[PDB]
Amino acid sequence: IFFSRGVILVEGDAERFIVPAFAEVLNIPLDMLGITVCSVGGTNFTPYVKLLGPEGLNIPHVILTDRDPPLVRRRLINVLDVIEGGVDHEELDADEVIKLAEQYGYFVNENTLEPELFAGGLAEDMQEVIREELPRLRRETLNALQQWVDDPAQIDEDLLLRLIERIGKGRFAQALAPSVSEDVCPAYIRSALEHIRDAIALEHHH
Ligand SMILES: [Mg+2]
């Protein structure tokens, strides 16, 4: 599925459907542009940067990953060792590695996708999906849910992810996609979308 002009590398199935939804409401048409969202099924991006980098197919691509408080430092040294020659990156600290990696379109999200979405403006639509998909939730759990809608700081993050993972991370994102709007888009996701869009448009411009 790689007759692609570009590739967006994501960790799992939630981003594989959330990121295309956010691209539409940002008017970045990924399919029209020939851009694939490819889930790497975890946090190892190195085989895929090898594949798309200069010593592979040399195809424009971006990375979207979580900070994980961090593991992201080694995760990004690994891809930077590929895309940046035999340059040494060992002497940089995590922050230095994160800001270097942005030049190549690799963006780090602090915290994690679904909680961030629930705090930052999608709380009430997520509760709605959760209840359509888990219709016989105990009343103790429905109330904890409403406790977080009323106040996205009362959030039990582990339970939220427990429910979503029970629904299915891909399936839950597919059902929340109709709800995303431009102003609730996380910044790292907008940065990756713009970076891959720029690189494709810069090619057409010569
Ligand atoms: Mg992660």
Residue numbers in the entry: 390 to 458, 464 to 600
Question: What is the paper's account of this structure, in its own sentences?
Answer:
Overcoming lysogenization defect (OLD) proteins constitute a family of uncharacterized nucleases present in bacteria, archaea, and some viruses. These enzymes contain an N-terminal ATPase domain and a C-terminal Toprim domain common amongst replication, recombination, and repair proteins. Here we identify and define two classes of OLD proteins based on differences in gene neighborhood and amino acid sequence conservation and present the crystal structures of the catalytic C-terminal regions from the Burkholderia pseudomallei and Xanthamonas campestris p.v. campestris Class 2 OLD proteins at 2.24 Å and 1.86 Å resolution respectively. The structures reveal a two-domain architecture containing a Toprim domain with altered architecture and a unique helical domain.
The truncated XccCTR construct, in contrast, yielded crystals that routinely diffracted beyond 2 Å and three independent structures were solved using SAD datasets from platinum, mercury, and iodide derivatives. These models show strong agreement with an overall RMSD of 0.42–0.44 Å and display only slight deviations at the N-terminus near the mercury-binding site and within a flexible loop containing two adjacent glycines (G479 and G480). Residues 374–387 and 458–463 are disordered in each structure, though present in the purified construct. The XccCTR derivative structures contain nothing in their active sites. Similar interactions are observed between the domains in the XccCTR. The position of these helices is consistent between the BpCTR and XccCTR structures, arguing it is an intrinsic topological feature and not simply due to crystal packing. In contrast, truncated constructs containing the C-terminal region of each homolog (XccCTR, BpCTR) were each monomeric by SEC-MALS analysis. XccFL and XccCTR similarly can degrade DNA with Mg2+and Mn2+ but also are partially active in Zn2+.
